[PDB]
Design a protein around this ligand. Sequence first.
Ligand SMILES: CCCCCCCCCCCCO[C@@H]1O[C@H](CO)[C@@H](O[C@H]2O[C@H](CO)[C@@H](O)[C@H](O)[C@H]2O)[C@H](O)[C@H]1O
Ligand SMILES: CCCCCCCCCCCCO[C@@H]1O[C@H](CO)[C@@H](O[C@H]2O[C@H](CO)[C@@H](O)[C@H](O)[C@H]2O)[C@H](O)[C@H]1O
Ligand SMILES: CCCCCCCCCCCCO[C@@H]1O[C@H](CO)[C@@H](O[C@H]2O[C@H](CO)[C@@H](O)[C@H](O)[C@H]2O)[C@H](O)[C@H]1O
Ligand SMILES: CCCCCCCCCCCCO[C@@H]1O[C@H](CO)[C@@H](O[C@H]2O[C@H](CO)[C@@H](O)[C@H](O)[C@H]2O)[C@H](O)[C@H]1O
Ligand SMILES: CCCCCCCCCCCCO[C@@H]1O[C@H](CO)[C@@H](O[C@H]2O[C@H](CO)[C@@H](O)[C@H](O)[C@H]2O)[C@H](O)[C@H]1O
Ligand SMILES: *C(=O)CCCCCCCCCCCCC
Lengths: 86, 120, 459, 55, 67, 110, 12, 155, 127, 172, 171, 80, 104
Amino acid sequence: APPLTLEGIKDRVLYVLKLYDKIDPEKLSVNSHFMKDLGLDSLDQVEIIMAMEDEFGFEIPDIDAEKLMCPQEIVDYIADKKDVYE
Amino acid sequence: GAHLARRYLGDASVEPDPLRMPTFPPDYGFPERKEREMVATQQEMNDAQLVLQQRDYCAHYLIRFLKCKRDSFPNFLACKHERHDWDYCEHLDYVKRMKEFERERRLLQRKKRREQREAD
Amino acid sequence: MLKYIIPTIMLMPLTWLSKNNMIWVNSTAHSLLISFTSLLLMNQFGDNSLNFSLLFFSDSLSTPLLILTMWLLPLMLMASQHHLSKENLTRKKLFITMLISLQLFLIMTFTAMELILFYILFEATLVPTLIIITRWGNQTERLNAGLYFLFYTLAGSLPLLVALIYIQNTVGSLNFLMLQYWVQPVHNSWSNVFMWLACMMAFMVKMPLYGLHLWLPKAHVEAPIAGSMVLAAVLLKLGGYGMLRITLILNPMTDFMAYPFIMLSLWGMIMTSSICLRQTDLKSLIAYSSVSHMALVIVAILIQTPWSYMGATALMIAHGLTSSMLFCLANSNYERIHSRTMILARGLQTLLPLMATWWLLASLTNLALPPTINLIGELFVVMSTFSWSNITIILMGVNMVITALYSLYMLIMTQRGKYTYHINNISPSFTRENALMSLHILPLLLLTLNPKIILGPLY
Amino acid sequence: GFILALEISNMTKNLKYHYPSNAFKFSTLLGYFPTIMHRLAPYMNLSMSQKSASS
Amino acid sequence: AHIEPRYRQFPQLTRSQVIQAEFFSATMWFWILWRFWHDSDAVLGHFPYPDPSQWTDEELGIPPDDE
Amino acid sequence: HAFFKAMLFMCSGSIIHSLNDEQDIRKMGGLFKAMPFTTTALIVGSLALTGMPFLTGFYSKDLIIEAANTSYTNAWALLMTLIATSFTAIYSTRIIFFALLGQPRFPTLV
Amino acid sequence: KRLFIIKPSGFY
Amino acid sequence: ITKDMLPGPYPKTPEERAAAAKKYNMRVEDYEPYPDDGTGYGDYPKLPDRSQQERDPWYDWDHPDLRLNWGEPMHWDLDMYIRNRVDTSPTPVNWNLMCKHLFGFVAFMLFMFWVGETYPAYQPVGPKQYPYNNLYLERGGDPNKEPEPVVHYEI
Amino acid sequence: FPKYEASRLSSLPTTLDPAEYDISSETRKAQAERLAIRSRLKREYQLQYYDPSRRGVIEDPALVRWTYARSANIYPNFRPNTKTSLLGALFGIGPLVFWYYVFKTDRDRKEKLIQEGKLDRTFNISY
Amino acid sequence: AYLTHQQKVLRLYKRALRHLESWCIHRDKYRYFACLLRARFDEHKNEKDMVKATQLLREAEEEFWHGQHPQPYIFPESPGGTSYERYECYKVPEWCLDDWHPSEKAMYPDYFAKREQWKKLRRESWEREVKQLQEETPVGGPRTEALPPARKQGDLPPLWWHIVTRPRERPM
Amino acid sequence: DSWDKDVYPEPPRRTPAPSPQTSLPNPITYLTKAFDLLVDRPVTLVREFIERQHAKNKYYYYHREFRRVPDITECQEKDVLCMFEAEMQWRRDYKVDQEIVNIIQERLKACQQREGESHRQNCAKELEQFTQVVKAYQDRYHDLGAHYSARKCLAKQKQRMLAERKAAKEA
Amino acid sequence: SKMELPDYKQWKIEGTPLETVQEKLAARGLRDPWGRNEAWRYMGGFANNVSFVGALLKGFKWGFAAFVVAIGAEYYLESQ
Amino acid sequence: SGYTPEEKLRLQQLRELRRRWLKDQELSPREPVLPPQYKTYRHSIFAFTHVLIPVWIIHYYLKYHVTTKPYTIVEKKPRIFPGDTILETGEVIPPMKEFPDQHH
Ligand SMILES: CCCCCCCCCCCCO[C@@H]1O[C@H](CO)[C@@H](O[C@H]2O[C@H](CO)[C@@H](O)[C@H](O)[C@H]2O)[C@H](O)[C@H]1O
Ligand SMILES: CCCCCCCCCCCCO[C@@H]1O[C@H](CO)[C@@H](O[C@H]2O[C@H](CO)[C@@H](O)[C@H](O)[C@H]2O)[C@H](O)[C@H]1O
Ligand SMILES: CCCCCCCCCCCCO[C@@H]1O[C@H](CO)[C@@H](O[C@H]2O[C@H](CO)[C@@H](O)[C@H](O)[C@H]2O)[C@H](O)[C@H]1O
Ligand SMILES: CCCCCCCCCCCCO[C@@H]1O[C@H](CO)[C@@H](O[C@H]2O[C@H](CO)[C@@H](O)[C@H](O)[C@H]2O)[C@H](O)[C@H]1O
Ligand SMILES: CCCCCCCCCCCCO[C@@H]1O[C@H](CO)[C@@H](O[C@H]2O[C@H](CO)[C@@H](O)[C@H](O)[C@H]2O)[C@H](O)[C@H]1O
Ligand SMILES: *C(=O)CCCCCCCCCCCCC
């Protein structure tokens, strides 16, 4: 497989969120909290994590998933599980 | 085939039993049956090492085919005519067995008529 | 036999007069040279045994057992010298002396031509074995294990002594050659039922027979590694060797006296193979494996046919090398993690690759993979038991299924899976340990090329 | 078989949800043979090994 | 390497891999059509199957119902 | 059987390798054009398995079936064998339909 | 980038 | 470990039930010995009979393969419940229904095979005929006895 | 929806167990102190597992109790009663008597046939 | 149960979506039925009576069990998946490098120089990590398996070695 | 050659002469010629060299002859010195008889392979000779047990002879 | 070497079965907010795939042409 | 529901250490520091050492050891067909008798 990079992971995490119709792609940043800034709820958060599992092809356990509330946290969680250090 | 439907779902008393056939004399209804002719001698099949199940009345065609097969090597597409001669002979043998089954059935049919008419 | 008795004795002065740092080097080197000369015993004839004197003879039954015995002494020395390193020097020399004295009693036991001389040496092995277990075992339970070992054996041996002396009074001789020509049939009577039992119970306890086996899981587990190696490889075979000899004078009464003991064995092996599936102690698992295998030897000896005697002889030799190798393999783990619990250290193939190969080879021989001599012996016994009664194929077949399950269960549990995280002292296998493993397996696999020398007198 | 298989395959693309049939589960779970045999037989044998033979 | 991965896009192909696949797909259909032409018997039947009901009683030696 | 069955397994290995060790057919799809040579071998292997005339499978399977319905044989066994031949074409179609046809259902990094 | 492969000692 | 930390006899009194539960790192409320039926369990805790395959895969076990934590009491039958052996996890289909469908399928197929052996399929063909008194000599018949002649005719 | 029938080898899913729901402050208290025991045992393990100077095996008393409970502790807690004696008789003597009559009966039949000459042994010369 | 009512509903949502995805297979069909399923969850989003909310959750679980896929999709490296624990045989603990022969270590002089620095960093931090844990833990041991960060400059987060130095997910 | 043709018979070989009915070349014919040149020839020379060395050092070994001693029938009971010789003789003849049955079994197996599909009729003589020898071997040695001896063999013979006398007495 | 991802604004459900789903959801008053995340599977070289019949007939065009050419050669080879 | 500040901070600090650890796993340019140490010819020495030398040994072994013992290599005797000529004796095998030469 082609190795992941922190910038590579971040781009795809933001890529997926930009294709979610409930997020404004112009108000979105790696630091956007899904509830406080983007105004989503928890049912939405489950779908976002579900979409990152499909994107990167591995499952995030529910106990871990519920704590990822901003795109940067998802980037950090994935890089940690895939041993991505750049 | 239909024969099974007649024997199992119908009346098996007038249906040949494949295990015990024939149940009539060979000459009944056949004044002077010719005896089947065998071309290949026992020694010839023995020396050709035919498989016992292959040493039937068509064995003389098989011997020709096997000899052609060896002599035409490596051309594994030759001997087609010899193979057909043996295949056709076996087809005629199978047809004979089909006739023997029909003769047995037609006699068992007759034997019932000749019993029903006598019975009444 | 003096060409083996005398040099075996000379090992004792050699060990005591060695430099303090050469006791292992000298004894191991010279016990190997004795092992080499033991091959001269294979001057066997088709008709006559090799009869040296009025005291000692050798035949195709005793010859392979003698060769196994003299080969094991060098291997027991290498296996021992690590865990005795801190031991006091004089106590180290005494430990080696017990092993040498055990070899001396064994090589004379397997070659004594007179049954009462066999009895005295058969019994003399108790002393060094008992001392080795109780003095140099590690746990508190070694003291109890020695008592069980001692009194289980003696409870059967003392009736044997009376029976043998009675046989000498009535026949006039206990020389085994004489017994071949002067033997008379045993006719039914309650008196002869108990003569038969007294002639066979001492040997059954040593095998051990199922029901009388409780001493062995205790003794084979509490002993130091060298003690376990000799207990499994050789001492269990004193029972089989004794039965093979004394059954000559028990016919035809063996016809119906064998039934209770064939039943205990046929069912016993399935019971003791099943036990191995739920064993938590690796050494205990191996010990219960020996009971399962020696059950076949008991059945083969009792049904008394030419094929079963060949199979019994092959099984005794093959089991000796395999069971000894397994104890040594488990000891190497124990010398690292200081515990016999099987589930404690897992995934060891990741940390000790070559030693995982030995585990595999030992496991395959244990489950009787053809054409190993383990399979050769086990197959010959099954062939003859089928003739004895066809239904025995069901019990033999089931045992072969269960034996594979526990043989590979032990391999999988210890060698495969994930390594235990907190165990961080798994040092790489030493040369001594690798050589010790290969000195079991290599001779065992070589014998496949020439199996006739381990098939006994009826070949 | 090809024709029937094609119709069955193409019907997966319709927007209709259908509760699984009993035969569907029987096929999917291999007739329950591994589910039953590989739990029952090991349990009986392994429990006997410890409770009766050993204890 | 010779082929680079793409993101959410149909992959890059080589000319060789496409041509070889077509050739062996085409070779399959030539073989089936070639054999079917010369060996249709092996699929449809090598010999006629006689209709036993079309056999006369004298062929089978079934005597008249009187005698 | 050795020929087309070993080929089928090597074709599945080719697909599994290309999708990062994915083995579920529900996450394949749209590979007919993306993996042309693997596709060709899979179709040839599937057709041979189902007894397509004059492929390797046909020269054994077809003779077996017509030797089994012309024998003196258990009727249930013959009927069960014939249904299994039909089922052979069904699961074969499953692999081709779900692995090769339709739209891709695999992750986005191709 | 070539990474270090952690293996148990093969020397012995 | 010391003798005070090893398994003991069946606990008779609530003070002994509290000592056993503490010894096994359990809550006294959760501690339940096996019944005191003389089978040799002593005070070893009776834990739920569930496979290790049933435990949470995502939790950080000290022994991930076993899915055990260091110090937690191990089930009496732990070695039977490792992930290589007996599985007790819930099934999509009820156990009793699973048995009915498997047994029912097998019994029906066996019944149908017996029927098919009673009503065999065969072709409308007479017996195959062989020459030379039915290959008497070839099949190993004695050459010193003249066999019962077998004659096959044309048709 | 037919209800879930739990078996020994097919346990009840937690999502269908009533005990999982309708939680009381008494149940949430039990869970809290269960989690405490696990947390205390974890800290004791980690303090040793992470120690740089530790080289060896972290001895686990729970493992030691388990292997001891399933070996040395069984006989001290054994009592000969109706249950153990009946089980011991059934599984100890039972099978031995059974296989005896199976083999004795089979071998008696065979010997009888051999005496009369009714057992085929034409090529049987290996035994 | 130690999961709140919220965590149970959210978990049931994800689990039911995954099993729905296994039935539907085709992405467009899945999107259609995932929105109908979302509408059902949104229909009782504001249910205030906890008793009625719990009963709704109970029924939803019963319905999920009836309608679950007998063979749901599992990610290959997830528990139960076809690649789960596939690479555990290649994960070798770092402490195995201490046993390497010197001739083996001489092949990677730069790697083992860095390794020594990490081992030095582990020794010199251990005492503070133990002390920090002692002084932040209430009497009677911790009540949770959570751990604190480092509170100072140069302090490392207590109990880090086996997190930081664990084997790579694809070691060989 | 090396073994006796009488002990190990082999019918005369009848290989048909090549009768090619094809224009194509026979690959086996050219492979055979290549085998003779590249394998048989160099191998033959290496052997001829070795045979030149064995002719320079010619020495002999012999087949042990065993004089006949009295059987166990002639031994006074419990007379070990005469019993020993008779017993050793009986054991030597037992091993030889085992090898005789092996020779007859090897003839039978060679015939079955040699005759191909015609073995059922062309190996009737070898089957008969095998049946007779196995019957004789069974009478001598079967059911004696692991502790077999000349004494037990005699008792088995006497029991058989007694039954034969009684059966004749019926006649 | 940064992997340049395609611009995200190019993925649109219009002209794909995802647009049909949105219409069937619009009738009931719902929306599919992830449709654009699936659109790449119905666009580009993944749009338009062979049917099952077409899959079997891969290579049938050239194979038949070779078959036609072959029998002509064989036929005339016998006649002449 | 997200991380608490303590949780976030611990993850932040572990992440720095883990990434530094992974970076240090990279090999330097000189590592490993090793100690001191066309088709036709390549395919020819394979045929020589793996086909010719073995067949030399096997042919020698079969010809001068295995075939010098009775019944070690037993061949099915050749099939003899009518019209064949025996090479050993020159005997001519008689042809089969005339068929009805029926064709269809
Ligand atoms: C693990 C333990 C195994 C135990 C095995 C038990 C085996 C039991 C063997 C019983 C057979 C003993 O042998 C038997 O002894 C009696 C002695 O009284 C002999 O019989 C003699 O005494 C009995 C009196 O009881 C008279 O009937 C008889 O007239 C007399 O000759 C029998 O002729 C003999 O057949
Ligand atoms: C520990 C497991 C216990 C399992 C139970 C085992 C029961 C075993 C009982 C021992 C055998 C007792 O039964 C024994 O049968 C044999 C025949 O085969 C008898 O043998 C004797 O009697 C037979 C006829 O009966 C005569 O040919 C001859 O006199 C002699 O062979 C013994 O006189 C008898 O004692
Ligand atoms: C022993 C019998 C041997 C028979 C051999 C017969 C000749 C072999 C033919 C190989 C075909 C090679 O040519 C290949 O054909 C296919 C199908 O037309 C072409 O594909 C064609 O259709 C597709 C879509 O419809 C287009 O994307 C493509 O641009 C177009 O050319 C390939 O672009 C071309 O590379
Ligand atoms: C021995 C090997 C034999 C191999 C036989 C191979 C298959 C033989 C043909 C099977 C049936 C052909 O398929 C028949 O025609 C067309 C496909 O062209 C199908 O038409 C289908 O097209 C679309 C696919 O885009 C489907 O979504 C739609 O549901 C359906 O109308 C018919 O539903 C089917 O009845
Ligand atoms: C092409 C295939 C060719 C081979 C076909 C073989 C068919 C074999 C059919 C075997 C059917 C046996 O399975 C049978 O199903 C019914 C329905 O659940 C079961 O019956 C069960 O289901 C319902 C309740 O859910 C009730 O009717 C009943 O209370 C219950 O027992 C039977 O207890 C079981 O015996
Ligand atoms: C009668 O000839 C006996 C044959 C037994 C069953 C054979 C099955 C053939 C089915 C024929 C139906 C036509 C569908 C192709």
